[PDB]
Design a protein around this ligand. Structure first.
Ligand code: TR0
Lengths: 103, 141, 86
């Protein structure tokens, strides 16, 4: 099974998919390959909860029902290790008002 | 672009595998689209048709095009035993058409003019999808 | 393999090249990175979702789901979609 994700950090958002059965550590390899920075220099999260390297993305909560192509789940990414920065994700821009034309 | 009047009975199953209320449409021996009763989402219907006849399906409220067995038209084949299976599904719409669909379905068409976007988009919103249109399109092939 | 699409407000979206080559505009814009002076983040994230959706579901019998759009976003999405040609 593929799961579809947004790996997110600061103003960085990566779109990628992965097997339900691949590991949190394997996701970090993929990030490494993209953001050019080693797995030990990075932590991953769902919501606030820090993820363990040897757990699969399934075990971590990312599943078919839950991480669909058109509605990928978010994985929080954090950096630096001689001290970890705190998980921080710049929110997206807000949509305008709504035109009163909208019952 | 018409049905063949073979008079060789054919049994079909229309399954609506789509979030839309489906409108089946049989093309006449002349060529006029004939509309048939509608199918709620998920729901099925056992159908009596005939070898070599033409069908196509649409959203019944808005006439958005749908796919049957991956393609645009459906022609009941040699029936062999067992009823012929017609799977009705959303296409992957372009993101533009998709946006048109949503916007059409929220606004009254009177008020399209009052939407602040380019003018060309205003034309596109009015160019509603429709059978006669698509039959002209589909015909040229 | 990946390209970067930056939104009007700075957010950066990293996406597979072929996902991105969905859009002929982008095709031409790259050919790497591309800045979108007029597409805000809440728009360009939806766009990338549709790229991932498109690549997933095109050429599949495996019943397809509705690509959802919130009303608030519809207009901006329509405008980006028309520009990007996709
Ligand atoms: C001889 C002869 C006569 C005809 C005209 C005709 O009987 N037709 C044209 C199409 O092949 C279908 C067939 C027909 O009308 N069958 C009766 C019918 C009635 C209702 C439905 C129906 C479709 C969707 C939903 C709920 C009902 C289908 C077939 O064609 N060859």
């Amino acid at each position: 099974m593929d799961v579809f994700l947004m790996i997110r950090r600061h103003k960085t958002t990566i779109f990628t998919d992965a097997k339900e059965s691949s590991t949190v550590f394997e996701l970090k390899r993929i990030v490494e390959g993209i953001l050019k920075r080693p797995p030990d220099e990075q932590r991953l999260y769902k919501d606030d909860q820090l993820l363990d390297d040897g757990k699969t993305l399934g075990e971590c909560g990312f599943t078919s029902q839950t991480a669909r192509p058109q509605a990928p789940a978010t994985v929080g990414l954090a950096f630096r290790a001689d001290t970890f920065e705190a998980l921080c994700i710049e929110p997206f821009s807000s949509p305008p008002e709504l035109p009163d034309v909208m019952k | 672009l018409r049905s063949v009047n073979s008079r060789e009975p054919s049994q079909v199953i229309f399954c609506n595998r789509s979030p839309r209320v489906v409108l089946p449409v049989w093309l006449n021996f002349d060529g006029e689209p004939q509309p048939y009763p509608t199918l709620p989402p998920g729901t099925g219907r056992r159908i009596h048709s005939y070898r070599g006849h033409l069908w196509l399906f649409r959203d019944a409220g808005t006439h958005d095009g749908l796919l049957v067995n991956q393609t645009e038209l459906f022609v009941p084949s040699l029936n062999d035993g067992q009823p012929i299976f017609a799977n009705i599904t959303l296409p992957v719409y372009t993101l533009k058409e998709r946006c048109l669909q949503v916007v059409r379905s929220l606004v009254k068409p009177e008020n399209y003019r009052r939407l602040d976007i380019v003018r060309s988009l205003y034309e596109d919103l009015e160019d509603h999808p429709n059978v006669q249109k698509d039959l002209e399109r589909l015909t040229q092939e | 393999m990946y390209v970067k699409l930056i939104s009007s407000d700075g957010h950066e979206f990293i996406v597979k090249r072929e996902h991105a080559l969905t859009s002929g505009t982008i095709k031409a814009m790259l050919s790497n990175e591309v800045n979108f002076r007029e597409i805000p983040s809440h728009v360009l994230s939806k766009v990338c979702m549709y790229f991932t959706y498109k690549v997933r579901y095109t050429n599949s019998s495996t019943e397809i789901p509705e690509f959802p759009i919130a009303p608030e976003i519809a207009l901006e999405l329509l405008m980006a979609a028309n520009f990007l040609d996709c």
